[PDB]
Amino acid sequence: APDAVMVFARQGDKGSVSVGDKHFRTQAFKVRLVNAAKSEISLKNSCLVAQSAAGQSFRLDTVDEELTADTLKPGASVEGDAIFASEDDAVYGASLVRLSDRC
Amino acid sequence: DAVMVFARQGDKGSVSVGDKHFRTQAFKVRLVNAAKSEISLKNSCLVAQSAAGQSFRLDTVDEELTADTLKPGASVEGDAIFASEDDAVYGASLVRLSDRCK
Amino acid sequence: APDAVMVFARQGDKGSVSVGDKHFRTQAFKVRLVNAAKSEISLKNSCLVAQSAAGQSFRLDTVDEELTADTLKPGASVEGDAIFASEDDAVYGASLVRLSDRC
Amino acid sequence: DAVMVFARQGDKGSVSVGDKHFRTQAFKVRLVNAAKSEISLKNSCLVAQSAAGQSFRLDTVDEELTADTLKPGASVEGDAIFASEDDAVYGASLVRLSDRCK
Ligand SMILES: C[As](C)(=O)[O-]
Numbered sequence A, C: 001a002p003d004a005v006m007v008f009a010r011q012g013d014k015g016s017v018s019v020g021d022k023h024f025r026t027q028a029f030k031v032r033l034v035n036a037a038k039s040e041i042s043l044k045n046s047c048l049v050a051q052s053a054a055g056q057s058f059r060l061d062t063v064d065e066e067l068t069a070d071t072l073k074p075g076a077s078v079e080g081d082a083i084f085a086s087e088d089d090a091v092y093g094a095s096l097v098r099l100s101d102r103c
Numbered sequence B, D: 001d002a003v004m005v006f007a008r009q010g011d012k013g014s015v016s017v018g019d020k021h022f023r024t025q026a027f028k029v030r031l032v033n034a035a036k037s038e039i040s041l042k043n044s045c046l047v048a049q050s051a052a053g054q055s056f057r058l059d060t061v062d063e064e065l066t067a068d069t070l071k072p073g074a075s076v077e078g079d080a081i082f083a084s085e086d087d088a089v090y091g092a093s094l095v096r097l098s099d100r101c102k
C-alpha cells in the first residue's frame, strides 16, 4: 500500500448560491480519506481541492467536520461531504478530488 | 444586506400543443434572511440564469416562495419552475433575486 | 383551452442497449396527454416523437400501454413512460416530446 | 445470436493517491440471453464506450456479472465500474460485450 492518504470521491448534487452581487455554482462530493501507510499522517497543513482536467482548482465552500481531522492513524478511514464552488459552471467539470498543501 | 438564495437543479421538462411549445427547468429554492431586519421582496423576482448570462422567466412557483417579505432569520422553501420557448433554460444553473421585474 | 392534445413530458433516466453489432442510447420520459378540447380526439394515426432543437427526431423504442389509447375523451388525461433512442448520444439532446402523424 | 446488454448510467467518481489518479463511471448492467441455447461469455469482456468511439476498461464488477455462461432465457444483473486515468470515462454512454479482451 502507498505511504500516503488515498482520496476517494463520488460526485453528488449540483447547486447554486446567490447573495446580492455574488453568485456561485456548487458541486458536492462524498469523500473518504484512507491512510494506507503504516504510520500516522498529519493533515494539519493540507486541504481538499477539486480540480478539472485542465488543472483549474475549485475552492472548498463547506465541509463536514469528519474530514477536518488533524491526523489519520495508520489503516484508518474518515468520510464525509465536501462542497466546492466556482462563479460560473466550471466546477461542474471538477473530476478529481485530491489533497494539497496550497490552502 | 440581501436575501440569500440557495438552489438545487431539479427536473427538466417540456410542454407541447401542436406547434406551440416550451421547455421547463425546475429548481428547489430556499430563501434565507440572514439580516437583522425584515427585507421586502415585493419588487424583486426570482430568475434562473445560465453561466452565459441568459435569464429565464419563472413560469410556476410554490406559494411559499411568493412571500412579500422575509422576517429576520427566517427562511422559505419550495420548487420554482423556469421556462424558455427553446431548450436554453436547460442551461440555467443559478437562481437569483433580480430587482428588474416587469 | 386549445382544440388539441397537450403533451407534457419530464426527462427521466438515461441508458443503453447493445446486442451483437447493434448499439443504442436511450432517454426515458414520463409523458401525460391531456385532451383540452370539448370533443373526443382520435390518436389512431398519431405517435409520440422526441425532438432536439435542431429538428432531429428520435424513434420510440418502448412505451407504456396507457399512452397507446386509440382516442382521448374531452377533458381527459392519460399518462405513462416512453423511451426514445439514438445510435449515438443525440437522444440525450431531445428536449421536446410532441405528437406527429409521421409514424 | 448474442447476449443483450442493458445498462443505466450511475455514479461518477475518482481516486487520488499523491499524483496518481483515475476516474470512475459506474453503470447498472443486466445481461439477458434471449437465445434458445447457453452462450459462453468466457472470451468476452464488458466494455464501456463513448459515442466518440473510445472504450474503457472494467476496474471492478459485481460477481453476478462474472458468469462464464448464460443459460437460455436467463439474466444476470449488477454494477460495473469502468475507469480512465483522465476524465474521458465520464463520456461513456454505452456498455457492450467485446470479443477483444486482453
Ligand atoms: C490548489 As493546487 C496544489 O492543485 O495548485
Ligand SMILES: C[As](C)(=O)[O-]
Residues within 6 Å of the ligand: C049, C051, C057, C100, C101, C102
Ligand atoms: C417525426 As416529425 C412530424 O417531427 O418530422
